[PDB]
Amino acid sequence: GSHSMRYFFTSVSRPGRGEPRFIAVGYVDDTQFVRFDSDAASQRMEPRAPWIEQEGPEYWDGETRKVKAHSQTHRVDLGTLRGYYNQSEAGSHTVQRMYGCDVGSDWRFLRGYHQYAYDGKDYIALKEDLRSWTAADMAAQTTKHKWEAAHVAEQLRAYLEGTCVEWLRRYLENGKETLQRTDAPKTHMTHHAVSDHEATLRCWALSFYPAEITLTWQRQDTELVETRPAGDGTFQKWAAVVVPSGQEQRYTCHVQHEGLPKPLTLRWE
C-alpha cells in the first residue's frame, strides 16, 4: 500500500523440442511494463506500458542484453537443478525467480526480495536482512553455501536498495498519470436463489485500482473469488453468501479500498 517494482522469470525445460522457455515480465505495482519471451519474433525486451515506450534505444538494447543473460543463466540452472535431484532428462521441470524492491509512501526503500523456486516449491530465498538466505532442501543448501562464499547476497542488496528503487521512483514519475492514480471500486449486489428456501446474495467490487481490496460479509460460509483483472487496468472481485429466505436484510457487504475514504456498506434493499 505504497509502491513496488518486481520482475518475474519462468524457464521451463522442453525436453527434445529445443531449448527451454523463458518469460521475463516486469511489473510496477499492478501494472505490467516490459516482457521477454523465449519464442518471440523480436527477441528484444518489449514495452507493455506507454510510459516505458519513451525509453531510448540504449535502454531497450540494455534490458534486452541483460534479459538474455538472465536466460542463459536460467537454462544452466535447470540443468544444474536436474543434477541435484537426479532427474531424468526425460521430464520437464520449471524454474521461477522473482526479485525487486518495495518503496514506502515517501519513495524510500522498504524491502527487497530475491528468491527462486523449483517445480513450484521454494528452493532458496534472500532473507529480509538481504545478507542471509533461506535454503529449502539439502540441495538448496548447496546453492546457499556456494552463494554465501561468493557474497552474492551482498551484491543483490546493492540492487534492491539502490538501483531498483531509483529506477522505480523514475518509473512512478515518468508514468505518474497511470501509476499514481487510484480508482474507487464500483460496487453493487445481486440476488440469486439456490432453491426455494435459499438464495445467493452476491457483492461486487468492479473497476478499481490498485488490486488490493477487502470484500466482507456479515449477518463463515462465504465464497470469495480471487481479484481478477478486467483488462483495462482496473480489477474486479466479488463475494457471495447463501442467505436463508426473507433473511437478506440481515446481511451486509462491506468494501474496503484505497479509493474509498470511508468504506461502503451495501445491503440488499
Binding site: 520482475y7 522469470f9 521475463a24 516486469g26 516490459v34 525486451m45 535502454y59 540494455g62 534490458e63 541483460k66 534479459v67 543473460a69 538472465h70 543463466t73 536460467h74 544452466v76 540452472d77 544444474t80 537443478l81 524454474v95 525467480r97 526479485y99 527462486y116 528452493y123 532458496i124 546453492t143 552463494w147 561468493a150 552474492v152 543483490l156 540492487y159 529506477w167
Partner: peptide, 7 residues
Amino acid sequence: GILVFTX
C-alpha cells in the same frame, strides 16, 4: 529495470 547468478 532488471539486475543474475546460477542456482
